[PDB]
Design a protein around this ligand. Structure first.
Ligand code: F6C
Ligand code: F6C
Ligand code: CLA
Ligand code: CLA
Ligand code: CLA
Ligand code: LHG
Ligand code: BCR
Ligand code: BCR
Ligand code: BCR
Ligand code: BCR
Ligand code: BCR
Ligand code: BCR
Ligand code: SF4
Ligand code: SF4
Ligand code: CA
Ligand code: CA
Lengths: 139, 42, 172, 31, 80, 172, 42
């Protein structure tokens, strides 16, 4: 379970919808040094509490925008985490994936979807006809 | 003519529609509403 | 120094959840609005799906006859206008019932998508089973056909009913 | 003197043959 | 989901990672550039295709490329 | 030296069972035949028994009016011919519904005999419960009565419909 | 007379029924078939 107190908010029209209860939902948790006003990702203003906060958001981009552009940039809060919550109740922490923010290089991270050539050396699509491989996926 | 109910006043169709509505159309639904009200479990 | 003043707010979050995209207003949460909406045949507690459809069909089929009788293209004659209004109600209701049928066919495959899935909590869409939709559709069609005919019969006999409501039937 | 009732009915029946063959081709192409 | 590829011309300026609004990208250790780091896309399932990363990329031509593919709920940016 | 050549046979055993008294033919197992038959209201997947009866009755009551209107003993006058056709459809449908009722009464005692027993696997007779047969019967009667009346109304107003479908109602 | 749709051609009753059938009787059932076809789960 995710712990924290929801920010003071009188209600809004940009909150969760059927997708939250049916497919997936996101939660962003952070700790603030004081009670202050922040902008909700989908409009309106909310008041983050003194201790640790928990906010439910419909999309992952809401958490990245709130944590990155407001918490880090404006409030100097660097401990925010984003969780993906499924209807069955399972919760996985997706940001930061390994506890280190992606913009900082961290050991043990593998190279994913790396092409060992310059982009101008991709093969022509005529060579890959009926093979099902895209030019950028070609070896 | 005096073989039917009529009205020389304005909108004489208003009694024509409202007498049935108040006296033998709506009263049974109103009684149903009151009966549901007075039978509700606590 | 920050005072949201939520405790004295005339408009509260809906059902105490500030993040459900809804407000507690007079339309959505007042005692009269809740009593009226929740006791309509679509939401009335305990009603069987067929009984829900029967009352909805009766109400809708009855008034759908009217528009073509008064301003329709057969309005010049009483007999023709009534027939056109009855057919218009039948065509609309049958088309709607066909839509309700194919809605049930396509929605309820495996775990339904959207608001009709198993984990959905949409209180405004309580018919969560395929069987309930087909029972509702049967009630909708029969109620709409009956209500349309009831309006058709009253309009077809409007001359007699007008004498009825004025006491002209008491001459002899 | 345009065609008669029988000719119209015959054409309707004849048109059934390309109608059924069009369905056969359409379903075969769908495979 | 969209496909995000990183080519060997990357200079490890971390600008694509900072520009991504859904955290698709991260910086991983590398040796092909002076910065000793290269961009990676482990979370392309969260990619919306905004191409903010390509705008941020300073190399010529782009060291990071986004190829729009099959649309999902999260790639369409749908809150419903 | 024996070559049954079953692998290249255009006509196969039905459903892979050579000993079920059936063949895989264009009528029994072709994709179009299966799609049409299995999607008739008697077999359509997910339909409630009442909704099955409503569609079956609607179609049958509608066309049962016709025969007595055209070649019946009251065909000399339009008004009489329509009434005789409506009554004939009502009498036939009520007789059929009475037979359906007594079918359900006698078939479903203990473990039903024949194709409606618990261990029977008759895919062509899927209504295995007494409740399903009564729900079907209610839909059959109401659908047949509605379809017969719908045909009756169109035939009774045929002069109006004929002007309707020719634009003769647009003179005034 | 020119107050109604008529036909001097053979079987002039055919447009009387075929126009309603193709244009406002069958199309909704046809759309229903297509809707079922394009929404079927894999
Ligand atoms: C466009 C538009 C349009 C149009 C056009 O213009 C129309 C028309 C029309 C015409 C035809 C008629 C009249 C005629 C006269 O005047 O004369 C007769 C009368 C009488 C006969 C009357 C008598 C009396 C009675 C019988 C009584 C009633 C009863 C009830 C139903 C009960 C109730 C129950 C519960 C309580 C509810 C009518 C009517 C109508 N309505 Mg119409 N509309 C429209 C609309 C609408 C809407 C929206 C809505 C809502 C939903 C609506 C409703 C309604 C109702 C309820 C109604 C009635 O009742 C009536 C009848 O049907 O009837 C029979 N619309 N409409
Ligand atoms: C002995 C034999 C015999 C006879 C005698 O001879 C008869 C007769 C007769 C006569 C009466 C009439 C015409 C008329 C005239 O011409 O004119 C009017 C028209 C109109 C009005 C028309 C109008 C238009 C409409 C309304 C439309 C349609 C609708 C639909 C129903 C819907 C559909 C839906 C889905 C898609 C299916 C009739 C009709 C008939 N049908 Mg008889 N029939 C017989 C048989 C049969 C069988 C088997 C079968 C298959 C079951 C059958 C079917 C049918 C159908 C569907 C029908 C239609 O509709 C019509 C009516 O009803 O109507 C109203 N039969 N049809
Ligand atoms: C208390 C006042 C009062 C009383 C006793 C009556 C009495 C009557 N009115 Mg009436 N009327 C009134 C005020 C009143 N009117 C007002 C203010 C209006 C203008 C909106 C009308 C408009 C009106 C029309 C259009 C018609 C009547 C008609 C009638 C007669 C049949 C009843 C009916 O159809 O009601 C119809 C009533 C209304 C359309 C609205 C009534 C509004 C009043 C203010 C409601 C009063 C509620 C009451 C005080 C609370 C009772 C509490 C309880 C404990 C007793 C009856 C003689 C009918 C008639 O003439 O038949 C021959 C008729 O067609 N009335
Ligand atoms: C010959 C077979 C046949 C017949 C007579 C009917 C008759 C009827 N169906 Mg139906 N239906 C059929 C096959 C048939 N169906 C099949 C195969 C399916 C599976 C897709 C359906 C699915 C279906 C649904 C989902 C619904 C109906 C409904 C209805 C009734 C209202 C009309 C309507 O909405 O049509 C809709 C018809 C279709 C969607 C498909 C019809 C396909 C057949 C082959 C049409 C044959 C017409 C033929 C070419 C020309 C003859 C008519 C002409 C001479 C006037 C009506 C009694 C409705 C009902 O019960 O109303 C309350 C309704 O909601 N039907
Ligand atoms: C492609 C050829 C073609 C076209 C465009 C038309 C066009 C028309 N016909 Mg027609 N007709 C045709 C061939 C064609 N006809 C043939 C070959 C026959 C003999 C069976 C008829 C018999 C016929 C009758 C009896 C009537 C019409 C009528 C009409 C009119 C109204 C539509 C209608 O009710 O269709 C009715 C159509 C049929 C009964 C059968 C049509 C058979 C054709 C071959 C189907 C062609 C399908 C097409 C090629 C596939 C399209 C693919 C898609 C991607 C576009 C319209 C002007 C009506 C009229 O005159 O109104 C005033 C009318 O009552 N037609
Ligand atoms: C007056 C005309 C009214 C409109 C035309 C009729 C519309 C519906 C007709 C087809 C319904 C049933 C579909 C096949 C029955 C069926 O279940 O087929 C099954 C067939 C194969 O499906 P799959 O490959 O997924 O395999 C599923 C298996 O069950 C069958 O192999 O798929 C189709 O839907 C067929 C191709 C699409 C449709 C092709 C075009 C439609 C016909 C075009 C030509 C019309 C000629 C008209 C002559 C009169
Ligand atoms: C009214 C009512 C209601 C509701 C209902 C519903 C929900 C309905 C639905 C309906 C529906 C759900 C419908 C549908 C429709 C459909 C359509 C309209 C379709 C169309 C299609 C088309 C047009 C196609 C096209 C195409 C394709 C896609 C492919 C191939 C080519 C073609 C062109 C063929 C309720 C219950 C509340 C109550 C009572 C009343
Ligand atoms: C909200 C509200 C309102 C409104 C209301 C409304 C909208 C109403 C409507 C109403 C209606 C719109 C009604 C209707 C009803 C109906 C009916 C009552 C029907 C009946 C029917 C019948 C009875 C039928 C029968 C049949 C059958 C079934 C079969 C055979 C044939 C016959 C015909 C017999 C108002 C503004 C006032 C006020 C405020 C609130
Ligand atoms: C006269 C008469 C009769 C009747 C008949 C009828 C009723 C007919 C009908 C007819 C019809 C009503 C026909 C139709 C046809 C159709 C067609 C001929 C179509 C075609 C189409 C096509 C060729 C195309 C196709 C395609 C493809 C291949 C693929 C994709 C899709 C589509 C569709 C585009 C009877 C025998 C009873 C008796 C004797 C006399
Ligand atoms: C149509 C229909 C159907 C159904 C059907 C059924 C299932 C039916 C049944 C029916 C039945 C189930 C019937 C029954 C009948 C019976 C009878 C007809 C009887 C008779 C009897 C008698 C004649 C008697 C005799 C005797 C004896 C035995 C002893 C003593 C002496 C004497 C002589 C009395 C279905 C669902 C498919 C679909 C829809 C439509
Ligand atoms: C297989 C096939 C076919 C055949 C088809 C048929 C056989 C058809 C029939 C059809 C029919 C035979 C149809 C019918 C239908 C019906 C309907 C659509 C009805 C409706 C009804 C209604 C709507 C009613 C209503 C009502 C009620 C319910 C109550 C009150 C009164 C009234 C009247 C309102 C052909 C050869 C072509 C081609 C090949 C394939
Ligand atoms: C109360 C309510 C509501 C509201 C509403 C409103 C505010 C409005 C509506 C409106 C509407 C919803 C309307 C409708 C309309 C319709 C129409 C306008 C139709 C028409 C039709 C026609 C005209 C037809 C014709 C025909 C015939 C008859 C036969 C064959 C041929 C033809 C096709 C020609 C809602 C939904 C929210 C919810 C529920 C309840
Ligand atoms: S396209 Fe947008 S979401 Fe996808 S990796 Fe680039 S910046 Fe991130
Ligand atoms: S913006 Fe371009 S150069 Fe900079 S780290 Fe990303 S891919 Fe490499
Ligand atoms: Ca009297
Ligand atoms: Ca007119």
């Amino acid at each position: 379970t995710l712990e924290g107190q929801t920010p003071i908010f009188g209600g809004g029209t940009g909150g969760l919808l059927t997708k939250a209860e049916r497919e997936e939902k996101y939660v962003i948790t952070w700790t603030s040094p004081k009670e202050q006003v922040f902008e909700m990702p989908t409009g309106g203003s909310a008041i983050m509490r003194q201790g640790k906060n928990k906010l439910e958001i419909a999309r992952k981009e809401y958490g990245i925008a709130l944590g990155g552009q407001q918490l880090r940039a404006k409030f100097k809060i660097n401990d925010y985490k984003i969780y993906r919550v499924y209807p069955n109740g399972e919760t996985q922490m997706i940001h930061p994936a390994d506890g280190v923010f992606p913009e900082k290089v961290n050991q043990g991270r593998p190279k994913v979807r790396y092409v060992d050539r310059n982009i101008g050396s991709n093969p022509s699509p005529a060579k890959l006809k009926f093979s099902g491989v895209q030019p950028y996926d070609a070896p | 003519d005096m073989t039917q109910l009529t009205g020389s006043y304005a909108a004489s169709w208003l009694p024509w529609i409202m007498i049935p509505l108040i006296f033998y159309i709506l009263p049974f639904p109103v009684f149903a509403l009151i009966f549901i009200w007075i039978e509700k479990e606590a | 120094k920050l005072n949201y003043r939520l405790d004295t707010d005339p408009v509260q979050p809906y059902k105490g959840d500030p993040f459900n995209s809804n407000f507690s207003t007079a339309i959505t949460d007042s005692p009269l609005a809740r009593a009226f909406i929740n006791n309509l045949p679509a939401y009335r507690k305990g009603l069987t799906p067929f009984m829900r459809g029967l009352e909805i069909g009766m109400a809708h089929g009855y008034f759908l006859v009217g528009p073509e009788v008064v301003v329709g293209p057969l309005r010049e004659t009483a007999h023709g206008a009534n027939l056109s209004g009855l057919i218009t109600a039948i065509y609309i209701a049958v088309s709607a019932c066909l839509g309700i049928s194919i809605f049930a066919i396509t929605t309820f495959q495996g775990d339904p998508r959207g608001a009709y899935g198993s984990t959905s909590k949409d209180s405004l869409r309580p018919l969560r089973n395929r069987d309930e939709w087909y029972q509702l559709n049967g009630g909708i069609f029969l109620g709409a056909m009956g209500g349309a005919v009831f309006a058709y019969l009253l309009l077809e006999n409007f001359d007699a009913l007008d004498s009825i409501l004025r006491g002209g039937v008491n001459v002899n | 003197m345009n065609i008669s009732d029988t000719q119209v009915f015959v054409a309707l029946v004849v048109a059934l043959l390309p109608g059924l063959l069009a369905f056969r081709l359409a379903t075969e192409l769908y495979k | 989901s969209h496909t995000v590829k990183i080519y060997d011309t990357c200079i490890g300026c971390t600008q694509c990672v900072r520009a991504c609004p859904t955290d698709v990208l991260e910086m991983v250790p590398w040796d092909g550039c002076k910065a000793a780091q290269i961009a990676s896309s482990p979370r392309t399932e969260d990619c919306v295709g905004c191409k903010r990363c390509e705008t941020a990329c300073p190399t010529d031509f782009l060291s990071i490329r986004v190829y729009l593919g099959a649309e999902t709920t999260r790639s369409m940016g749908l809150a419903y």
